[PDB]
Symmetry: C2
Subunit: 218 residues, 2 copies
């Protein structure tokens, strides 16, 4: 019946991969933006947040916190977690790599300014030499359109999301990886994702530098 | 039916929670310790580490890397991931909390020394104010012996592992949490876990100052 309700800042942050996944699955959701310290305190004092944190998603009568919990639940419900325990293993392995990399990119903006130069270079080296090669190799090994089981799964969605963030960081990093490029294009033209990528969707922009040091106040 | 094979340093690190999970499920496994930079290099070069890192576990024909992938697979295989999607959600929410706190503790002795006292104080605050209250609350909510579905799940095992690390860090942290102290004892007395906690198991010691020149 009910639309998932997403409690987060009006920003990408740790809720954006859920927006991508729900949108990819064709699921219409509502959002309730935390705009002040008091909004967050009200979620806390109302007992909505198990560990005092957002993201939180109201879905099927649960108040799910922890990004991975929310995502695991959504992906099973909408058949984007593979067909069995072994396909789930490949998906989890792949998406956890994506998450480790995504986490490095997510936190880069709060990086101590004196180590931003070093770290950015490292993230680029890891993208070039560790992550992109690993996914290019998987796609080459089986020659199929999707990462796992020859059908759309959360892994394709989480990877493609990440390809957009890497493109924002440095458009050249994907250039020597043709199969990642083709995957990006295919996934981006699935009706649901195409709609999500179009102006007007719930997809969120990059956090700007002026509007992050303002989201510290909460 | 190969025995699962765990490739990791001869240390706790990021493989310990898998050692606890397998042992708790009564699953006999083997370990191949990385002792040199060359051991790691050979695994990387021979294509067995998808992201050039361990932990890696050989199980059911896969070379599984990423802790969470390894743990999720083992939990499902041995019926410690609950009965349906909604129990998995509760379990996931609990264990992700456990892993966030776990991660902080894991990385503490690698903090630059002039931050190390501040990090510890923040960990203890989170333990007393965030994490222990959350898990005490769940235990009192249903008053049962297990976190979820009135039967042993990975959540019990991951939590009780963490209560052992929290004990090592500060023995007083658990003192105002009687349901947590009771879970530690009960889980620790399950035959499999009891064996694991006894000498001669694959359970690993804390790192010592001198061992960290690894």
């Amino acid at each position: 019946a009910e639309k998932p309700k997403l409690h987060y800042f009006n920003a990408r942050g740790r809720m954006e991969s859920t927006r991508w996944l729900l949108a990819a699955a064709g699921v219409e959701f509502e959002e309730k933006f935390i705009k002040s310290a008091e909004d967050l305190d009200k979620l806390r004092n109302d007992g909505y947040l198990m560990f005092q944190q957002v993201p939180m998603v109201e879905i099927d009568g649960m108040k799910l916190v922890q990004t991975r919990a929310i995502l695991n639940y959504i992906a099973s419900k909408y058949n984007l977690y593979g067909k069995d325990i072994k396909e789930r293993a490949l998906i989890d392995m792949y998406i956890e790599g994506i998450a480790d990399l995504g986490e490095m990119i997510l936190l880069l903006p709060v990086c101590p300014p004196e180590e931003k130069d070093a770290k950015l270079a490292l993230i680029k080296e890891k993208i070039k030499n560790r992550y992109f090669p690993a996914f290019e190799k998987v796609l080459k090994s089986h020659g199929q359109d999707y990462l796992v089981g020859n059908k759309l799964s959360r892994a394709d969605i989480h990877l493609v999301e990440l390809l957009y963030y890497v493109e924002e960081l440095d458009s050249s990093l994907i250039s020597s990886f043709p199969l990642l490029k083709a995957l990006k294009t295919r996934i981006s033209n699935l009706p649901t994702v195409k709609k999500f990528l179009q102006p007007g969707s719930p997809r969120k922009p990059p956090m700007d530098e002026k509007s992050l040091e303002e989201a510290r106040k909460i």
